Amino acid sequence: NTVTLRADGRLFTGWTSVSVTRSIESVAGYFELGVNVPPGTDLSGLAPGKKFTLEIGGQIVCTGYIDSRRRQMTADSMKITVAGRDKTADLIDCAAVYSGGQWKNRTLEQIARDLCAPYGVTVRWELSDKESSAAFPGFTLDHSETVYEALVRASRARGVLMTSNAAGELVFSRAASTATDELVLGENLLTLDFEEDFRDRFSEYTVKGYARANGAEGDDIDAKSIVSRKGTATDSDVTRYRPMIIIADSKITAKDAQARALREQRRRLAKSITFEAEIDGWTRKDGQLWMPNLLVTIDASKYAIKTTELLVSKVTLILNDQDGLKTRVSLAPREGFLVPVESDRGGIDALVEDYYRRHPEKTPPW
Amino acid sequence: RVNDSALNRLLTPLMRRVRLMLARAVVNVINDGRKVQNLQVGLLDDEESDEVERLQNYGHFSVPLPGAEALIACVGAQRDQGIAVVVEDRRYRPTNLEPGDAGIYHHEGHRIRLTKDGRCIITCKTVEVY
């Protein structure tokens, strides 16, 4: 279980301290290693801009480019580190470049594939929804906007969440369905932390915006319905009044408004309740590493906790000397990372779609 | 948000939207078939915008020629919902007039001008009342 950093040319195996991070609430997974060498040796394989591939054991965790390298030495100590992110983090700080700033009738996957072409990032679309693939009647790009900003703006309206794969690709992820692992307070937990704060969760999220009137719809739409648009999503966990009004982000319809309102309600639900645990082993029970987007069964019933299933949201692996092998796994409810079409557990079309939604491994009719 | 660059990254998008709300543009194609004029404008650089509606007051109409300069006012700071409020054609504008004047015009003479001392001049070529 050695952490090998495939840099440009050769392998690097031994390390003094390793820290890797992965999450689905982010578009990259950053790593930081500590290297210790005699003063005067050549450290050029670890330089900013080199193409790195981190490999834990025989499996690749991150791939991309090296960002920073710190070297310090005092009268009684010496410390050298190195850092980096994915190749998907190349989009975060780079400005989106396209010829015609407007896409007339395109879907989110096609927009992303046209935007991530010059860099090298490959886009991956996992959702099998019929409404998440609905094409944009028109989508324009603000000038000097990063690819990350544009794709996040589109994915927020679609309800999809954008993430980075373990091989450097872009991913429009799908939440897990089958409970795979178990975390109990008695057997395999060193430390738990259960925070439950209600300072942000509201009752009724309602979104208001402007209708579509640019061109073809301008010969049909009237004057009042251009300005009068609305969407609502109600929560049953807050029993007081507690409303919220959201100004839309782009041109809006009723169904689009309802989708964003839920998107917001589910994100608030995910951000409210948080579980944190420190397990002893990097590897899982089966043997693979711990990664986000996994549905685990929590049995912290000796501490009077009544949650039964959660979804991992953040995994950070540590190799400090004082720590040993640890991985701090953070947990959030699954119902916070779903698309507005699906729900947590009127015709033949509805029945067939239900069947093919309950069974995702089957091929839809499309 | 502790580092200078981190604060810059956190605060940049708001200023970008503020700076991109109001804008200038040029007019390349005008479509009048729709109930509202649809311009095809050209923004800062290597940026086009097709099907941009133009808004004009009630009771007045005009079809500008290609090449006019428009003031695009984005609604809600989105670079979409772009609406052209004014489309000036500086190449064909009447100049050197009296302090108080008001009148329609066309891109080759054709001035219905109202002049100081109660003069409703109508300079045209073939006036046809109906």
Binding site: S26, I92, V152, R156, M162, R267, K271 | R9, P13, R17
Partner: peptide
């Protein structure tokens, strides 16, 4: 720097705007 690193990394849930 827990929040100072979440800015340099992506955030599919927008902080502002």
């Amino acid at each position: 720097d827990g929040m100072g690193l979440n800015i340099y990394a992506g955030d599919n849930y927008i902080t502002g705007w």
